[PDB]
């Protein structure tokens, strides 16, 4: 048989609802439908089951409609949450009635949940160091389009800092690197068309 999952990456805002597609070409009389879940720690969790002659599935926030004509299944989550970002799978039970069977899987539709609208906030910039390598911390900012340049004489290596989401609602960042002149290095941060330095905090 065959199971198809066309999408490869989706992203929706908080407190909205999503829908994923699963089309299966089968040639049996009775079957069962399973939707799964994998966290980025590689852990597989059973989510919900539809059934052939059953009505529309609904288990909490999970709602499933079933079309026996085109053989299409749609999975919808009512309320979104920041920890709901996980790949989802479509699994076909053939025939789904014995303990010697197997399952066939799709390919996975990863979802991503992004924070909602928040007021503009000024970044706060600090610097800490150890040995040769130095790193300048950047506190909350919104937008996420912040470019940080470190002013020094000898450069060794650069890295892309972070796009990390803090739990308050505003993103954070930490940029690393090492420089030969590690005595005193600062970084310049520009956000919302304005540039904020690091030395002005003291």
């Amino acid at each position: 048989q065959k199971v198809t999952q066309a999408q490869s990456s989706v992203s929706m805002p908080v407190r909205k609802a999503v829908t994923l597609n699963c089309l299966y070409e089968t040639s049996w009389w009775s079957y069962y439908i399973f939707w799964y879940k994998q966290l980025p720690s590689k852990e597989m969790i059973f989510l919900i089951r539809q059934g052939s002659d059953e009505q529309n599935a609904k288990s909490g926030r999970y709602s499933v409609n079933f079309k026996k004509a085109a053989k299409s299944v749609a999975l919808t989550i009512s309320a979104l949450q920041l920890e709901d970002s996980a790949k989802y799978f479509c699994a076909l039970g053939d025939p789904g009635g014995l303990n010697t069977d197997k399952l066939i899987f799709g390919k996975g539709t990863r979802v991503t949940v992004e924070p909602r609208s928040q007021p503009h906030t000024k970044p706060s910039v600090f610097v800490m160091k150890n040995g040769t390598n130095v790193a300048c911390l950047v506190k909350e900012f919104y937008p996420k389009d912040i470019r940080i340049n470190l002013v020094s004489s000898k450069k060794i290596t650069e890295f892309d800092p972070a796009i990390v989401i803090s739990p308050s609602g505003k993103y954070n960042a930490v940029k690393l690197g090492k420089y030969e002149d590690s005595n005193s290095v600062t970084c310049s941060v520009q956000h919302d068309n304005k540039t904020v330095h690091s030395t002005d905090f003291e």
Binding site: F34, S41, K42, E43, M44, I45, F46, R49, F89, G96, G97, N99, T100, D101, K102, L103, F105, G106, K107, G108, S124, F126, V127, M128, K129, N130, G131, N133, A135, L137, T157, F159, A162, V164, S166, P167, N172, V174, L176, F201, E202
Partner: protein, 224 residues
């Protein structure tokens, strides 16, 4: 907790699966490679003790070994670089939620990396402590410190933040694994509120190539 098994070519590996099943009848094995789909590979019946391969698989490649009652293992032989991925373990159980419908419960996975280099011996992570700036505590009365790990292989890793007192792991912020000349490096950081500045706090890593097989211990002196 997911693990990692690393072996060279032309050798064998053991993958252990850790379910807790009482009235077990069958144990199905799988594989989930990157860009591909999870596919079944064989299965095994408890009562007769027989291996039922899949179509196309050469005999003498997969073995299931039971070392005591309700304990199962999968052994792999003649490793080639296409063997690498994540391996699971399932039974049809009805079940963990204790319902009326047979649903296949899954294990937790194990990453297998088939290498060819075996170049450098010590590929264990090497910590570095960044001492927080006292100027930061002057404005907002909060301290932030960064823990940096470097030179580890493979890329499977874990990070925790302790407080040396309770078995509660503090919520922190995490970076991203980045490859530096065929070896990876990573870092994470935590913020301390003003009310716990005098308390000591701890950070532990979990990697396959830890020295003596035990978790590395990182001890952060309290801020003065």
């Amino acid at each position: 907790g997911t693990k990692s098994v690393t072996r060279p070519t032309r050798s064998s590996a053991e993958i252990t699966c850790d379910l807790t099943v009482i009235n077990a009848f069958y144990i199905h094995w799988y594989l989930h490679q990157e860009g591909k789909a999870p596919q079944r590979l064989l299965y095994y019946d408890v009562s007769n003790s027989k291996d039922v391969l899949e179509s196309g698989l050469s005999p003498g490649k997969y073995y299931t070994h039971t070392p005591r009652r309700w304990s199962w293992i999968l052994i792999l032989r003649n490793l080639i670089e296409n063997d690498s991925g994540v391996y699971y373990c399932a039974t049809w159980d009805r079940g963990n939620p204790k319902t009326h419908y047979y649903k296949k419960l899954f294990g937790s996975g194990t990453t297998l990396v088939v290498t060819d280099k075996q170049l450098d011996a010590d590929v264990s992570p090497k910590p570095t402590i960044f001492l927080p700036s006292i100027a930061e505590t002057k404005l907002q009365k909060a301290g932030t410190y960064l823990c940096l790990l470097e030179k580890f292989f493979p890329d499977v890793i874990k990070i925790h933040w302790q407080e040396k007192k309770s078995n509660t792991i503090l919520g922190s912020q995490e970076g991203n694994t980045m490859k530096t000349n065929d070896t990876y490096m990573k870092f994470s950081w935590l913020t301390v509120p003003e009310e716990s500045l005098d308390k000591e706090h701890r950070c532990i890593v979990r990697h396959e190539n830890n020295k003596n097989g035990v978790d590395q211990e990182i001890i952060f002196p309290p801020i003065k």
